[PDB]
Amino acid sequence: STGSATTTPIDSLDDAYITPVQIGTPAQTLNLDFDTGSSDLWVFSSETTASEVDGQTIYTPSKSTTAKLLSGATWSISYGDGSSSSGDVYTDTVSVGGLTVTGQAVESAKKVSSSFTEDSTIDGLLGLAFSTLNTVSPTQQKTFFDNAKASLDSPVFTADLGYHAPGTYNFGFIDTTAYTGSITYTAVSTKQGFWEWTSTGYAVGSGTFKSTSIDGIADTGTTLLYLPATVVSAYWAQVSGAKSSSSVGGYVFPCSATLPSFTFGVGSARIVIPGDYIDFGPISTGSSSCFGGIQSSAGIGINIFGDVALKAAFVVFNGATTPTLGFASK
Template identity: 50%
Template sequence: MDFDTGSSDFWVFSTLLPSSESAGHTLYNASASKHSSLESGETWSINYGDGSGASGVIYSDRVVLAGVTATSQAVEAATSVSSAFTSDTQNDGLVGLAFDGLNTASPSKVPTFFQTVQKSLFEPVFASALRHNAAGTYDFGWIDPSKYTGKITYTPVSNSSGYWEITANGYAVGSGATVSESLTSIVDTGTTLIYMPDDLLNAYYSQVNGSSDSSDAGGWIFPCDATLPDISFEIGSKEFTVPGSYINYSPYTDDTCYGGMQSSDGFPFNVLGDVFIKSQYIVWAPTVPQMGFAAPSRWTKILLAADGVVVVDDEEGYGSLM
């Protein structure tokens, strides 16, 4: 399941799909659950920013996720999914963690997973500890002190649009001075990259030798061996830094790479996607609503080589001794 703070539907691949759309996926079978019941007349249909989508009918069922139980959760069973979802056999559905205003159920909206379980949690929060090039974690109902350092800085969230919308007060490139600029942005685990205004991108990529805004690539590219500066966003009274190495998102050609920060021109908002989220420990508190940000803990991985030599791999990330 894809945990998505940019949508509000809990939907799954189901046995109601044609085999051409469900091959390779684990399927939800409502008839095999003694807790399921069809929500008569309720349907759903969602379209995502990348053009993918899904639709279907709705059941009420018991859902257990990471030890957290929703005794009567609205489960949106897909009867149709787009080709992008069909081909992604690592993903059997989405857990929408945005606010309920984005829920697509009709004629009546249905509660999100978090709405269903929040009263049973020790604290009405969830936290993300995602990592760069490694598996991360989500915690429901508590804040894990082993996964961050220092204090958590909280900032208000506007949920009027249904998204986790915050305002950064400015940015700094590398060790440069902070540029004051109001950057209203959504924080979205369902978006991979950071999308920001062109003035910020020009300021950033002007410090990357050989970079260019390529129409063929559809965004900023640069030599793969280029040194990338950090980018920091001022949120509340603190600056939160994305290491420059995170901005090297993926190869584009043999010797050029595609940037992990691109233009938000044409978007209804700026987006702090996974490239940013992986650089922070984040507390999501929907009942306030607010978000908290803290520097992630470091973790140390001790590897025992075949010749008996101990190798210590110290990386930015989360967790304890591995």
């Protein structure tokens, strides 16, 4: 089997992407944030504290003839950005782009933090990291991909995120029309539960490539590109007037700037992030200070190849017995 679903930016900045997901019988379609940096499929629901729901579409398990309470199971998750959610668990039928999993753990939120409430466009998350990170207790649950994998034509999924445009998540096949040139595959460590890999270096604009190993995670659920302070300083030094602002929470730059591109290495291959992808717009409405899309990972504890990086590539998440990651230009 295979599946193919369009993923759509939630706003004009590509802050996140939503993908429609069918849950239950009859289907209840929710727009979920597919997150290769976590491993829980959770939804706003009829159980979510009413004051914490503001415009989201909810899953109502009592209206699904295939929903079953997973007795005694609870979940609770905290994300890198400080947001969180928790609740109880149902199993139900879940379909993405025509690919159906029966008995998927659907984690129903009883509580969500303010950032989730305030984002009316995201109805929940669908985790695509390794199932070892799944938070369900006392019996850990499998991700949608893990459940689907054996049925798939090939044990892979691909992320093809758009810049200010829709893109695609495919399951079970590689669309050879969706990228240019060849796909370069690179080793993955699953030791921390992430799609963790090592970039071979970087360049700023038309500058020379610096060969240096940068360990990090391919994370569709993180907006920006978070890299070591040395790398980030080298980038922003090429933008007149750019500076790190403790008050704003990262590098800012004059909105009048033309940003240079940023290149990262995948083996001997190179992925080029155009400068425009690095512009996250005014820090506040009407400001002439703009927020940068490349930020320091110092104090996160890990480098993160988030959407800014991934949307410059066609990315293969190869879930074979020994997982790997593939990157192609597009």
